[PDB]
Design a protein around this nucleic acid. Structure first.
Ligand SMILES: [Zn+2]
Lengths: 75, 147, 124, 119, 186, 172, 71, 74, 91, 107
RNA sequence: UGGUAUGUUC
RNA sequence: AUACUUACCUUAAGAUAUCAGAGGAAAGUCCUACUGAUCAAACAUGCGCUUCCAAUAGUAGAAGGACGUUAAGCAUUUAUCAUUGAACUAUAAUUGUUCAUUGAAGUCAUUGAUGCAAACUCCUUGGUCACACACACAUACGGCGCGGAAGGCGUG
């Protein structure tokens, strides 16, 4: 059985499993948080978001993250 | 359909109890869906099918609170196609009765004994034969689970 | 070499082009085909590049600059249009415009004969 | 409104296309494609130095100018004078227009005016 | 090339013998991780205090957008023709000229000849019933006959057959034209 | 639509399955093989001349040619050159398919032979020869050829063939 | 448009270079038409630290995806 | 369970902070209206190239591709 | 268009392609797509700073390709012919 | 109005496409540029190569490409300690839309 | 009302 | 070749120069082997248009190559990281130096690479055309032989 990546992002939403989002480099932060809703374009909204430099980084509350930047969504 | 971004939106829009939900897709394979690709397609499935209901149903089976009248609904679907194609394979056996040919029930169509194993393997890997095979062993498995 | 003022990339089939890419590399070859995305097909295109060591002789100040240019030979390549930056024309085609016309009329004759034959053969 | 249909109207005028390298292309403009593929003819590619001594310039675009084949071998600055350049559209950053042309004749979209009269 | 992953036989696949392998040259661009446009895009607000004031002292008034003027002119002339249409619709009961007897007997005919007569079209309606009144409409600015006329007959059944005949037969033969016919509809 | 300029035939709306089925078809594959055989034959045997730009011979040149002599030209007949050019083309073809394979004959008993020379057990192209075989859908050709296949395994040790010379070999 | 031809790489270990430097190796569980890929038990090869139980990679950032198994 | 397009429709005429991907520049301001491409129009906006606030900005149109994230501010 | 169809002609022949990262790959072309995704087999892989290795198969996303070098006989392929006439397609 | 905004564009009729373009320019984010086109006020545009232009918009477009008059380009160049402010005046200019980052309407 | 493909029979 | 068996398919829409004027089926639509103006294409056809077209009265030369030799040319510069033991200098946990041991990777090259420059050998290409072996020219130079190549412009 295959799990397409829409299904994996939707399982991250449905179980609220906390994700680390690797943005693409030369920015140099990562977003930790929980996925509340995701787009067709892989925009995601994050509740209780933290940004981390590359584990002392700032909190953001709830953000909309544009999917052009995202490199990995890992748990 | 056209641009890839438009194609995904349909899938995600489809990701996001029985009045508007088909049961045959939700139990197993919807037999509307299985030979819709080939020529023997009756047509499109008239009741709506979603992936979100399939994930909810896998959640409901995994928790263990299964409800078997749904499976009785699905068995009521299977019996039509089983009896119709069983009549039709007996029509095929009557045509074969009334250059060596044999009739294969498990596709419901003609084969020859003269042809070799790899061409016959090609025919055995078909939309019609595999839709039939999932249909039939699912039917016999539901019947033996009833008995 | 002089090129016609109204010569688009569809006219310049079989001319020898000079395609420039984003990484500073020049591809030189006979043009075979092109596409909507502007990705070429070049027949005998030879890649050239300026090495980083030779490069500071290009910077603004002898009379003439002499740049040893690292060239590789590749043949019948297709480029990708995303990388192409601009194209310039280096050399005219082998055949003259009149002689190119003669060849095209000949080829039209031979092709029409062959499909006439294939039709009358499928009839019998 | 697409301004590419504005830009196609020019068709015989000395422009200066400033590309994303930093290289600027001055020349008589022939056609413009619907993806902004300018074809200029009597062009003079040049790469402006940054007037501060220590700052270098684009180095890749120096290589690109020399490799066009038109750099004058005695020349001090990076200029390359070449008949017929053809420019893929995504490269253009801005197009310096001539002083003389009247915008209020050219910017009238005939098709927008057409539908707006029709409806 | 000891082996063939292609569909062709060996002799055909030897014909597609490639060139020798490409030589290696050291790169002159940026490695893929180091590629970026400009970061440290500086802020826009510093301009707004100082540089904008020089710009406003230098160019105080913008040039007029005369290209939008033509779109607005066709829009306002559409609105103007709507207002004139409102006036012309403003100027039946006060019509008077067609205010002869009741509209049950009154047939209209249209696209009949401007250069026709009263008596020949009246006889044309008299073909299908007795005539009580007939009236051509001529333009009140200048008396070109408008090609429309109202004929009230002595009976509405005869006028119904007249409208049927003289409209349904492709518009009755006019002096030089096709005269459709129907009821008054006023 | 899809049109195969090798086969010269239109087909209905191309789906990757239908098109991929066509490109491995048998009729298509013999016609494509013929096409490139003919084009390689042409770019060998194209017999076409360079332009000859003929310069006016100097007088100082033309004295020394007057000394030497006319030299006789040998020219064959029509039938003779027909036969001899058939023969020469045949010689170039069989000299092109000639390959030297002696060193595989000489090492035929050596201890690590199967792993290097069988070419189906090699470690670089061992998987590729396995993938190269065919679908092999007509087994009637396989039953028509009644040889034994006689494959060499990789598991051979030097215990088999202890004394190679006991009538097992033939001379070079 | 058209889904990539990775039906033969399913459930096999695979090494792909994200961006130009990172190299992630995992078991391929699913793919999309953008070449998004989700692989279980990922690890980032440099010592090499594991990512997580289930990751997705945006195929915008994948260059090449060679397979470290049978196929 | 809130998706991104309803999230942006919900933030209409509400204070929001958008940070561009470049310099960690951020614009904090009230959201007037948003596109299908998520182009952003901000009113009474202030500019933060670091934590440092440089100024106040009247109305800004922020182009769709540059924004890293959009957050709702306290 | 013609260039993508030329890449489809080269299936089963040794092609060499240079990616946008700088890497070079030379191997058989097993499968190619309309998007230019290519799958090379028995591939010799040269990294940008020059190290060479051997890969059994590789799938490169076709967005990353700079150029592809196909065999040299394919200039005689029939899709380059200008004057060409079709057999009147069927229903 | 709202329903044409929510619907996917491949379904919409041709007149609905033209209607949506007018609607998004009138009541939208690009409406900002439109007001400065009509009220004839200068805008400050910040480009991707770290140049800032001050200009008036003569026309604009779906991709945010815009024809500008009285363009003034401001930029700064730095090596080490050293920094120079360079400024240039151009009369009429086309600006391709992909370079812009932020567009500000001057009060 | 079709196309390509496959293999059998003669 | 026929025939039969299966297996795989059986679709993005729309358009064909523009502007103005007259006519036909108050607003717009459609059309006119209608009429103006602009544009574009083909084909003829010209310009005192512009550039280029190789010795034989000689053994040459021009343009472009070499993935050619001299050639190991001449001048610079490169060839791992961690752990442990031993001697060792020392302001020093032993920073420096040498020898051995375990582990980790590791494109080949060092006759290489890079910088500079020269000679030589050889390939492809061309009107190797005709009349001439000539005292010209300030408005600086009869551009007043036949062709060919490539563009610029004009007319039909
Ligand atoms: Zn074919």
């Amino acid at each position: 059985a295959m799990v397409p990546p829409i299904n994996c992002i939707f399982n991250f939403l449905q179980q609220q499993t906390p994700v680390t989002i690797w943005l693409f480099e030369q920015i140099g932060i990562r977003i930790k948080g929980k996925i509340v809703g995701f787009d067709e374009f892989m925009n995601v909204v994050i509740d209780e978001a933290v940004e981390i430099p590359v584990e002392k980084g700032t909190p953001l509350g709830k953000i909309l993250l544009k999917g052009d930047n995202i490199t990995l969504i890992t748990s | 359909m056209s641009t890839p971004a438009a194609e995904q939106r349909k899938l995600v829009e489809q990701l996001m109890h029985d009045p508007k939900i088909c049961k045959s897709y939700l139990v197993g394979e919807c037999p509307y869906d299985l030979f819709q690709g080939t020529k023997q397609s009756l047509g499109k499935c008239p009741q709506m099918h979603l992936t979100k209901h399939k994930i909810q149903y896998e959640r409901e089976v995994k928790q263990g609170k299964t409800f078997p009248e749904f499976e009785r609904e699905y068995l009521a679907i299977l019996s039509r196609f089983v009896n119709e194609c069983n009549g039709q394979i007996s029509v095929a056996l009557q045509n074969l009765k009334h250059q060596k040919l044999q009739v294969c029930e498990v596709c419901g169509a003609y084969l020859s004994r003269l042809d070799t194993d790899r061409r016959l393997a090609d025919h055995f890997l078909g939309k019609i034969h595999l839709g039939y095979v999932k249909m039939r062993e699912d039917y016999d498995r539901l019947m033996k689970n009833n008995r | 070499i002089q090129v016609a003022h109204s010569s688009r990339l569809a006219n310049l089939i079989d001319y020898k082009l000079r395609v420039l890419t984003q990484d500073g590399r020049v591809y030189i070859g006979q043009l075979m085909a092109f596409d909507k995305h502007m990705n070429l097909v070049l027949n005998e295109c030879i890649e050239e590049r300026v090495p980083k060591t030779q490069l500071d002789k290009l910077r603004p100040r002898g009379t003439t600059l002499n740049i040893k240019v690292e060239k590789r030979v590749l043949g019948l390549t297709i480029l990708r249009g995303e990388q192409i930056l601009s194209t310039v024309v280096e050399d005219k085609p082998l055949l003259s415009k009149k002689e190119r016309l003669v060849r095209d009329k000949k080829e039209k004759k031979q092709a029409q004969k062959q499909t006439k034959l294939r039709k009358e053969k499928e009839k019998k | 409104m697409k301004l590419v249909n504005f830009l196609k109207k020019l068709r015989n005028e000395q422009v200066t296309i400033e590309l994303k390298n930093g290289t600027t292309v001055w020349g008589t403009l022939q056609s413009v494609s619907p993806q902004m593929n300018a074809i200029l003819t009597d062009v003079k590619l040049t790469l402006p130095q940054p007037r501060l001594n220590k700052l270098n310039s684009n180095g890749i675009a120096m290589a690109s100018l020399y490799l066009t084949g038109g750099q004058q071998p005695t020349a001090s600055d990076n200029i390359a004078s070449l008949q017929y350049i053809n420019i893929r559209g995504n490269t253009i950053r801005q197009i310096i227009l001539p002083d003389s042309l009247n915008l209020d004749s050219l910017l009238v979209d005939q098709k927008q005016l057409n539908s707006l009269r029709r409806s | 090339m000891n082996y063939n992953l292609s569909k062709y036989p060996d002799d055909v696949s030897r014909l597609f013998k490639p060139r020798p392998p490409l030589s290696y040259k050291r790169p002159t661009d940026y490695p893929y991780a180091k590629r970026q446009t400009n970061p440290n895009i500086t802020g826009v607000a510093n301009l707004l205090s100082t540089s904008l004031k020089h710009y406003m002292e230098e160019f105080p008034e913008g040039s007029p957008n005369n290209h939008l003027q033509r779109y607005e002119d066709i829009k306002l002339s559409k609105i103007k023709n709507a207002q004139l249409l409102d006036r012309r619709l403003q100027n039946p009961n006060v019509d008077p000229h067609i205010k002869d007897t009741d509209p049950y007997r009154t047939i209209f005919i249209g696209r009949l000849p401007y250069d026709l007569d009263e008596i020949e079209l009246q006889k044309y309606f008299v073909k299908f019933g007795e005539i009580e009144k007939i009236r051509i409409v001529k333009d009140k600015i200048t008396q070109k006959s408008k090609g429309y006329a109202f004929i009230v007959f002595k009976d509405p059944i005869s006028s119904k057959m007249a409208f049927k005949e003289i409209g349904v037969h492709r518009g009755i033969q006019i002096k030089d034209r096709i005269c459709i016919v129907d009821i008054e509809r006023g | 639509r899809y049109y195969c300029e090798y086969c010269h035939s239109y087909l209905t709306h191309d789906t990757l399955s239908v098109r991929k089925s066509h490109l491995v078809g048998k009729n298509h594959l013999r016609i494509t093989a013929d096409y490139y055989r003919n084009k390689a034959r042409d770019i060998i045997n194209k017999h076409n001349h360079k332009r000859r730009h003929i310069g006016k011979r100097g007088r100082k040149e033309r004295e020394n040619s007057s000394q030497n002599e006319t030299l006789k030209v040998t020219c064959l007949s029509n039938k003779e050159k027909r036969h001899i050019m058939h023969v020469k083309k045949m010689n170039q073809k069989e000299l092109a398919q000639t390959s030297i394979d002696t060193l595989k004959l000489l090492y035929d008993g050596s201890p690590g032979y199967s792993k290097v020379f069988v070419d189906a057990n090699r470690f670089d192209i061992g998987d590729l020869v396995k993938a190269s075989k065919l679908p092999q859908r007509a087994n009637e050709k396989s039953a028509h050829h009644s040889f034994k296949q006689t494959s060499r395994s990789r598991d051979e040790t030097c215990e088999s063939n202890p004394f190679p010379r006991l009538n097992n070999p033939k001379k070079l | 448009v058209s889904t990539p031809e990775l039906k033969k790489y399913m459930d096999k270990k695979i090494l792909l270079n994200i961006n130009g430097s990172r190299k992630v190796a995992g078991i391929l569980r699913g793919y999309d038409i953008f070449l998004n890929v989700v692989l279980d038990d990922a690890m980032e090869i440099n010592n090499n630290h594991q990512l997580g139980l289930q990751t997705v990679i945006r195929g915008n950032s994948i260059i090449s995806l060679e397979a470290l198994d049978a196929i | 369970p809130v998706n991104p397009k309803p999230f942006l429709k919900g933030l209409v005429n509400h204070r929001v902070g958008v940070k561009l991907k470049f310099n960690s520049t951020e614009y904090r301001g009230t959201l007037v209206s948003t596109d299908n491409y998520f182009n952003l129009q901000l009113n009474e906006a202030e500019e933060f190239v670091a934590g440092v606030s440089h100024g106040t900005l009247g109305e800004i149109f922020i182009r769709c591709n540059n924004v890293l994230y959009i957050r709702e501010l306290p | 268009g013609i260039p993508v169809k030329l890449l489809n002609e080269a299936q089963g022949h040794i092609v060499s392609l240079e990616l946008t990262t700088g890497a070079t790959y030379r191997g058989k072309l097993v499968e190619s797509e309309d998007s230019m995704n290519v799958q090379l087999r028995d591939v010799i892989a040269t990294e940008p700073q020059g190290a060479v290795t051997h890969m059994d198969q590789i799938f490169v996303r076709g967005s990353q390709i700079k150029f592809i070098v196909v065999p040299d006989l394919l200039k005689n392929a029939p899709l380059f012919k200008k004057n060409s006439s079709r057999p009147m397609p069927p229903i | 109005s709202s329903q044409i905004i929510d619907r996917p564009k491949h379904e919409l009729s041709r007149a609905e496409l033209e209607e949506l373009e007018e609607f998004e320019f009138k009541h939208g984010p690009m409406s900002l540029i439109n007001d400065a086109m009509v009220t004839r006020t200068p805008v400050i545009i910040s480009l991707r190569n770290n140049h800032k232009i001050i200009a008036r918009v003569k026309a604009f477009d779906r991709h945010c490409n815009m024809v500008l008059e009285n363009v003034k380009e401001l930029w700064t160049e730095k090596k080490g300690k050293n920094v120079i402010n360079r400024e240039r005046f151009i009369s009429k200019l086309f600006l391709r839309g992909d370079s812009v980052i932020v567009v500000l309407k001057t009060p």
